[PDB]
């Protein structure tokens, strides 16, 4: 099980209209990721917090998983999730996360300042905390804050796909990643690939080699990509789909119809699941004795 949670979408503001070449390149990179081997892919949509958010719901998600990705998934064989990263610098008054969190699945953040970082670590209900590996770090990251945030939830994300962009960016990328690994105590680390084209994608072994050269062990990398990725997906799926982790609208009978796994069955415009009657009172309780 391999999860990639940082596939960028060729759009930053809602004023942009995505051409067919970009979605075709995304189709090609999804096919590339499926060729070598992958299990879960969640595309990212970066937007800024300062500008006004449109006062709509059915126009906030320009992904259309059902029309094009739903048309290609039956041939591909995997699932796609929508993710949004809130790049916050100053505490402005524009804040309507109650709609974006419910419309999207996973909500992440990209702070630039220290006050924004503190408020996103304490009060903002998010899932992943991403740092600008292209730019420098805001200030000296402390240990206690990151550890209490990991124990409270949100983990840090390392984007090894950015180091393939430029020549001078690799130094700052390494200087940020080493500091993040040192300050996070190597507990809440999730790795992603921020590649916009299939030309900058790698295999799982290349990722393992790069991360073990950076300083994190290989077994911990595999553990974080196997279970910590599934858990951070489950968190963002259950906090939105279900209530505050008390009642889930998904019923797993076997091992394939799970709230994060079963995506074509569970309705999304509502939260119902129309299934034929399979549980009455006249059937024998013991499953080993119950035979049809």
């Amino acid at each position: 099980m391999l999860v990639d949670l940082n596939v960028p979408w060729p759009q930053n503001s809602y004023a942009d209209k995505v051409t067919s070449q970009a979605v075709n390149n995304l189709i090609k990179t999804l096919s590339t990721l499926h060729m070598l081997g992958y299990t879960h892919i969640a595309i990212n949509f970066t937007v800024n917090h300062s500008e006004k958010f449109p006062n709509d719901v059915k126009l906030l998600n320009p992904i259309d998983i059902k029309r094009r990705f739903g048309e290609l998934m039956d041939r591909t064989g995997l699932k796609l999730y929508s993710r949004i990263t809130l790049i916050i610098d100053d505490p402005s008054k524009g804040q309507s996360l109650s709609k974006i969190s419910q419309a999207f699945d996973i909500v992440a953040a990209l702070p630039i300042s220290e006050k924004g970082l503190t408020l996103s670590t304490t009060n903002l209900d998010i899932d992943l905390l991403t740092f600008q590996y292209g730019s420098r770090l805001p200030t000296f990251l402390k240990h206690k804050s990151i550890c209490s945030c990991v124990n409270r939830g949100v983990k840090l994300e390392i984007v090894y796909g950015y180091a393939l962009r430029d020549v001078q960016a690799r130094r700052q990328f390494v200087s940020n990643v080493r500091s993040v690994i040192r300050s996070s105590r190597s507990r809440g680390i999730v790795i992603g690939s921020g590649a916009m084209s299939p030309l900058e994608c790698r295999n799982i072994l290349g990722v393992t080699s790069l991360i073990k050269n950076l300083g994190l062990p290989s077994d911990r990398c595999s553990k974080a990509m196997g279970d910590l990725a599934s858990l951070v997906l489950l968190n963002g799926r259950l906090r939105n789909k279900s209530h505050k982790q008390t009642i889930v609208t998904g019923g797993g009978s076997g091992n394939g119809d799970d709230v994060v796994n079963d995506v074509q069955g569970i309705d999304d415009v509502q939260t119902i699941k129309v299934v034929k009657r399979s549980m009455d009172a006249e059937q024998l309780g013991h499953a080993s004795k119950r035979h049809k």
Binding site: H143, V167, R170, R171, V174, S175, R178, R182, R185
Partner: protein
């Protein structure tokens, strides 16, 4: 869990590269002809830039990126040619090898960089520097006779 630093003490020694002039063979004479002085065109940003260029040229891209995160010159004065560079405990050997591989300054030629003392604290570095400076005066006083 704790940021471990390690300072390196280095010295600039000028060898008497002159075959037309015969030299006196003793301790303090060669100590004085090797510790003559540093040229005027000597600074901290001029030595840091030179060592960064040398490190990027010898090690490479990642080899310079991993060491240039905490590579700073804390204390250095051109009067005696003794400097203290800060670095990490993981890349200390790489910084020592870069100091060894220092070829020449952009304008000044014929010089050697010698690493003397390396430790993870500045107090012991200062103590060793004071001890070395006190030891230097002994041979001088003995040879002045």
């Amino acid at each position: 869990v704790r940021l471990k630093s390690r300072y390196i003490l280095f010295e600039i020694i000028f060898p008497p590269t002159d075959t037309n002039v015969e030299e006196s063979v003793s301790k303090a004479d060669i100590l004085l002809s090797h510790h003559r002085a540093s040229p005027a065109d000597v600074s901290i940003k001029s030595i840091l830039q030179e060592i960064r260029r040398s490190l990027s040229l010898n090690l490479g891209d990642y080899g310079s990126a991993k060491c240039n995160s905490l590579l700073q010159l804390k204390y250095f004065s051109n009067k005696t040619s003794t400097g203290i560079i800060r670095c990490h405990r993981e890349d200390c050997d790489l910084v020592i090898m870069a100091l060894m591989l220092m070829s020449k300054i952009g304008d000044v030629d014929g010089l050697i960089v010698n690493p003397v003392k390396v430790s993870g604290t500045i107090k012991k570095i200062e103590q060793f520097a004071m001890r070395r400076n006190s030891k230097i005066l002994n041979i001088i006083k003995c040879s002045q006779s």
